[PDB]
Subunit: 168 residues, 3 copies
């Protein structure tokens, strides 16, 4: 009925468990999207995604810490790293002049799914924060991550010469 | 901790955000399934899915309308459209004689996943509706959409010469 | 705003519906993963997953039963079956001493997603059990299933010669 966390134990359906459990779910979706980005044209994105998976483990670990039992690993440095990539990718992709619908190339499509799962994880983290103090940087990281995912989804389509699917 | 919606702002974990966010999740699964349905053999289903992505996006917009600054976009006409297609596809598919397990062709399998996500979205909309007034057509649309997805999943397997996976020990 | 279940009716957003609805979601991911495992190299895992889809369907049926209207279908025998396969696959897979990134081959990746959805279903079942009586065996089954999925995910990658990627916090 309960599970152990870092510095204590909580019920298996505790919002804390839901939080890092959904981070795990998002990390798994990214893992799948990566199998679609093994092309030589995406070595950079694949490599960045791979690192993000480790950082997601960092996020899950931090969220599992009760009363700062051990040091937090997610820092503002990792958030700013994502922000720089987001800027670069927005620059690479064609100008955004229409509302985008999720889809296009299969790689971009799976990235859009991962994007929504990351956003779902963010909501769970917000819920956790409402009852216990957390590494607030984790929330910022996950928030920027969905923006990063949206950005590379459009870059993935563009590199493959596929127009983004637009609301029209 | 909050996010801007149409007419104001709400907490990021507000049941309203969970609702349109999950609608977005379902829409993304549909986008992925569509990448497996581009052939000439699926032009009818693919076009209907293209339209559904728009209506799903509209559903999300209607759920994000806190301070009704604008009229809702999802109408009953769109729900009836799904109902007619559901009957059409049930007719096309083989007789349903056993319980169906999700799977079969890759295309059908992804459509089945989308179906379960649409149902998860429906549950969030039900919860939202209990707390605030919503465009009730959205709930009806989402409810019909999962039946439509189930229907085309079977049609997809049939067209692809694959038998549906059945519960049969 | 309600839905029919076995021996009654409940609100469509009832924790009970969330539970079997998520079992359904997990079952659908398994079904998709199965399309990637039809090769001769995975006959054993594919057949086990075929059976698991039935058991998962049974889990949902058991969760939809209000006040033991009918006998439960999920039994401890099926839980033990999972446990035996778990040891078997941990034995086949290379030694594991660190957390690893979920992914690798397309098949393993989809299995990892299924694993996380099964765990999400487990949380809903835990919540359900706090409100009403349920077939406790279902909770034990879903609990073991996520470990089984983790195990075959690593085996699938191993069989495809895909090496696990260990978490970069090397002291963990």
């Amino acid at each position: 009925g309960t599970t152990s966390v870092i510095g204590g134990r909580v019920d298996k359906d505790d919002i804390r468990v839901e939080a890092y459990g959904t981070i795990d779910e998002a990390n798994s979706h990214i893992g799948y999207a990566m199998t679609k980005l093994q092309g030589g044209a995406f070595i950079d994105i694949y490599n960045e995604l791979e690192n993000i998976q480790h950082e997601l483990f960092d996020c899950g670990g931090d969220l599992a810490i009760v009363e700062q039992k051990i040091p937090y690993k997610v820092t503002i440095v990792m958030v700013e790293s994502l922000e720089r990539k987001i800027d670069l990718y927005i620059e690479e992709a064609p100008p955004l002049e229409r509302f985008i619908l999720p889809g296009g190339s299969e790689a971009a499509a799976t990235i859009h799914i991962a994007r929504t799962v990351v956003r779902r994880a963010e909501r769970s983290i917000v819920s956790l924060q409402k009852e216990v103090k957390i590494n607030e940087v984790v929330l910022k990281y996950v928030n920027r991550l969905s923006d990063y995912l949206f950005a590379i989804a459009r870059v993935i389509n563009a590199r493959l010469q596929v127009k983004d699917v637009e609301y029209n």
